[PDB]
Each structure stands twice: as structure tokens, then as C-alpha cells.
Symmetry: D2
Subunit: 189 residues, 4 copies
Amino acid sequence: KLTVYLATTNPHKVEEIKMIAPEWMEILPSPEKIEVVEDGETFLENSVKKAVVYGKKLKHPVMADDSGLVIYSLGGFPGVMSARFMEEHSYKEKMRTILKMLEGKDRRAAFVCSATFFDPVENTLISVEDRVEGRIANEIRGTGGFGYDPFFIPDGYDKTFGEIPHLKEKISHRSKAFRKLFSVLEKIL
Amino acid sequence: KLTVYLATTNPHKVEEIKMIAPEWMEILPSPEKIEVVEDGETFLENSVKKAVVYGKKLKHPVMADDSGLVIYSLGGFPGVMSARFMEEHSYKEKMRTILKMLEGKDRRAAFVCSATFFDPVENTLISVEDRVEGRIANEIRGTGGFGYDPFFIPDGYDKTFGEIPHLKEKISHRSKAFRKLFSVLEKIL
Amino acid sequence: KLTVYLATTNPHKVEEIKMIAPEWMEILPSPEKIEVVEDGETFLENSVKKAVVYGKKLKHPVMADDSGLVIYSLGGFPGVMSARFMEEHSYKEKMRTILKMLEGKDRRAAFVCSATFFDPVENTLISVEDRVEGRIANEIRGTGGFGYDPFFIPDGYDKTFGEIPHLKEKISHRSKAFRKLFSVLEKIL
Amino acid sequence: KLTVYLATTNPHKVEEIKMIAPEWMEILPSPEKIEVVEDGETFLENSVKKAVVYGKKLKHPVMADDSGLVIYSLGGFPGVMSARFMEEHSYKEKMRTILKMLEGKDRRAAFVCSATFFDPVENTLISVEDRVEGRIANEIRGTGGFGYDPFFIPDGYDKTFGEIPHLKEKISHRSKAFRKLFSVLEKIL
């Protein structure tokens, strides 16, 4: 009933969103990789920018995601630099480095997702945020998920998202933010 | 029940929004004039920018408005330059100049408003657009309203908004866009 | 000695710049048309933005030009909107429309050019501006040059740049701005 | 001959720049602290942005400095985030944390400075960059200078800038970048 483009060519993000989409939404990947300067100070600003840039180009409803790992004891690092930090290195190398940063520090953290819908015909924009609170593990565990998953333990669990990646579908920042978005869209469309 | 700041110090805009607010919303003017570079290509982009800048500063829910006159035969001019065009001149001078531009041209036009709500605590942003279609009068008539009102005739009428300013409350771009916003907020908050 | 790309495919700008380039500089139009959102409030900001985006992509020295017509009695219009104003219409139609706007007004104006050099390897950026003062003619005359040239008469002359395009090399905003830029470069290279 | 405002109240930058300024230039810290969103991906973009915003407001020539520490094995971190990284913590804590990140890694680094002059009356903008190559020490040493100075050892020396701050005037990124800028200015003023 509604076909919507995603404003990301990140395969892990497309998979994760497709698997929680409502029965009434056909989610397609953008058929063009569009350049976006992601220079927002916050996830919301980057999610909105991407949504707007893709929507103006495609002239069709789009959704975007800007997301990140926030470690409270490190001033919220890496945050909006989650991908850009050590971007030519593997996530395993990034996690080993961040584990060294946290020696002697409080390990509380969150993954945060800002999910944005833009219809460029009507000029309706809806952006909502959600998060999964947790803590950084003391070592990397598992190879499931992607990115920082193998050292993030969600609230309520003792295993990392690398160890129990199936739980992302229920409790991740992305699943929660996009379900929050879908709920709004069900009300207003 | 909800106190919301407006992200505009324009007195005419504050009046117009206050008079259509729902009984559950207390609308206050921003207690600080905040500088915003309005460099968006579209009303939506400027409405979002203002909402975000004020919201991040005030740390409290805000709404913004970016609005303009769009004349189809003049490529949509003045559009986002509605205020900036001849800004040191009176609106009477602006209208006399635009009347000369339109000699021999189709007079169809619209006022367009993008109304944006941002809650910077939750990071929820909602933006919606609406419009009042009409035509440019052949001369300036009346002193009601503000800005280009005295030469804009809405669809369904033969008088300008300068002549019948009371109708803005029912049919203007601003009344319609903000009511559309309020409707969404009633559903999701 | 120095090959430089120009951040425009506007053939008139290319020709105009090539015709005053010093013997030590080879000028090439950019072989890739790079998208830049030209949202600067001034010619300098748009010129810098173009230089930086193009240089970052090309990884080679570039120059950029942002130029426009500034009519003082119209608050500086069209200014940075010189191209975007009625962009789907011919400059002939844009001039006819502007002539109607100017009836009864002061007719003084200037063309303004901001010329920018950027070397992305060294991270050296140099931007200089110049202008040619004049007046708007009562009618369009000549087909020489480009853009608004056929209704702009430079001080010291009674013919438009449409009529005397050969004089642009000597007196235009673009010739003066670029010569100023090349002078700087000659000193510091 | 020329009075110039500096677009910073950082007293160390002020002192450092004043101590190498030529006899013909009077440097004044900006008497108004002007808000700039420093969202550039590079030092040059942030330096230019600051120069332009401050100059537009002050309506007088200004210079700006955007500088940072670039550690190559950390993908160039902290880079443009040099200040923003753990901004609520002391540089001592930031250095301790970075030391932990670097355990077992290549320890090469550079300080980089982009120095920009802007004359808003003429619309002349000049930006030049320089750097000092070095390595990160195994421990924090000295309290001289500012920021990351106490764990950065410039090539040719065995002491940190914390230990030998007097040498910054001669060899630092900021001294070289500004001297390069003043050389240009001496030629073209």
C-alpha cells in the first residue's frame, strides 16, 4: 500500500528495517547512492538531512536512520562519529581500542537511533528517536550483528549483541525507533 | 497542559497562531531572539532549521513557521525570499513592484506555510505543510493583515486578505498548516 | 607551470576567464560536474563553497566564480539569485520583467564577481571580489555576452555589455576579480 | 598600520599569535564572543567559517584559527574533535585516555593549524595551513602550553611541548601557519 525508499545503502541497516516493517509497507533500497554531508551535531540532525536530501532527489517517500553508540563515561563518544571513528579499521580494532579507553571507567552505554520519514510531495516530515540502554562488555564476544554489537550488552542480559543477535529484532534502538515511527504513520496516513 | 514556545519574534505570526491554538496548548513567545541563518531552499528546510535551533537553545518544546507567497508565472517568486526581497522597503512598495512584474502574466498564486513542532527532550520532530491558493489582485486593496495580504485574493473570494483579514483565521496557509500540525499532535502525544 | 580546473561548465565564464589567464596558467573546465548546494547569502560564500567541494573531489587546484547583478533600488536583487530567478525562462524574459520592476526607480546597478582559488593538497584558499558599476538601460540591446549583459551599461559608456561584449575583457567584474586573484597568485607561487 | 581582531578568546591562542605578529599589525581578541556552529569536516572549513561569521558581525578585518591533534594510527583522531572530545574533562584526563588507546600502536602524530584572514569590507579571504610532525610520548610531561601539548614531542626533540613551550614560537603548527599567512599579507597589502 505504501512503497518507501530507505536512505542508506548500509546492508545491515536495510536488513534490520525490512524485517520489522509493517505488512502495509513495501520497503525498497534507494536505487541511487546519494552523497550526503552528515555534519549534524546530533543523530536527529543527520537523520533529517539524509531524509530530505534523498526525498528531494527521488521525489518519493523515504525513510532515513542515523544511529550510534554513546558511552556515558567518555562524554558520549563515539556518538555521531560511530562510523567515522577509525573508519578504515575493522570494528574488531575499534572495539579493542575503546576497551582500552574504558579501563577504570563506568561501562554504562546506549545505542541511539533517530528514524525519519519524509514525503517530499506533501512535505510531511516525521522524526522520532529511541534507544537501547546497556553496558560495554569487558571483552569482545561473538560475531553476530554488526559494528559494535560484539561488545554491547543490553539491559536485562549478560550476553552481547554479538552473542545474541536475534534479540535486536525485539529490543534494539533501531527496532524501537522504527516501530515508534510506524506507529505514528499508522495514525496520520 | 502543553506549554510551547514559538520560534519567531514576528508579532503578526504570534498573534495568528495564538488565536487558533487548541485549548490544551499554552503558546508563549520565545523569551530570547535567537539568530538563525535561514539558508534552506524550501519552506520546510527553514521551518525545521528554526525549530531545531530554538529547541536546542530553550531545551523546551517549540514550534516554528516558515512561509511565503508563491506566484506561478514568476517561477514561484518571491517564495523563500518573501521577506528578504526589498526588505528595507515597505510591503506597499514590494506589492507595487510585483504588480509591474505581472503585467501580461497569469496571476495565479499561493501562500504556503510549513509548521514544525520539535520536542528537544524526546527528539521528536513533526513538520507539515499547507497552502491557500488564490490570485494576485490588479491593485492593492485594504490595509488589513500583513505583508502581501493587501494584494492576495484567496480562491472562493473577490476581496483581498487586506480587505477581509478576518477570513485568515479559517482559510489561510498558516491556520491550515498549524491545524494540520495540531491534529497530528493530538493523535501522538 | 600551473594547470587549474574551473568549477563551472558555463562556457561564457570559461571563455571569459581563459581570455585573461596569465601565460603561466593552463585553465581546464572541470571534467566532472559536481553538485553543490549554493546556499550562501553572499557571492564570496558561494564561490568558496564551490571551490572547496570541487577541489576536495578533484584533488587538484581549482578556481570558482560566483557572480551576479545587484540592482540597488531593488534591495540588491537579483544578487545571489541572478540565475535562480525565473530559471526556466530566458534571460530575455527575465530582463523584460526586471525592466517593468524598475519603472520609476533609480536604475543604478553593479555586476559583482567573487573569484576563489583552492589548492586541496596544501589547503590554501584565496578569494577576492570585484565589481563594475553601471546602470540598467531602458531596453534590451545586443545579443553579446550572456545573462543580463544586454541591459547593463557600464559607467563610461553608452552601450550595453550586449552591444560591446569585447570590452568585458578590459572592464568587467569577472576580469577585474580574476586579475586581482592572479596577481596574488603570482606573488605567492 | 593594520588592526585585526582574532576570532577566539582562547588566551593561549591569543598570546601565541600576538607573539609572532609583525610590527605592522595590531592584534585584538574579539570583544564580542560570536556563536559559530563549527560543523566543518576539516580545519580549513572551520577556520573559514569562523573568520566569515566574525567578520560579517564585526565589519572589520579578522583572523581565525582552527587547529587540532591528528594521530595517524587512530584514523586522524581526535582531529576536528580535539576540543569536543570529552569536553567536560580536563586535558589531563583526555591525554590519559588517549595514552590507553595508543597502547601497542604506531605513535606518530601532528598538530595542524588552519589560519584565515578575512576583510569583510573588500571581501578578501586568505586561508593557509601548516603542521608540525611528531609523536605521542609514553606519559604526560610538563604543564606548559595548552591542550594536548604535554604529550606531544616534535621531531628533532626529546621533550614535549609541555616541557619546552618556549619552542612553540619557533616550530609549532600555529607559528608556521600564521607566519605563512602574514607573509602573504605583507605581499598583498
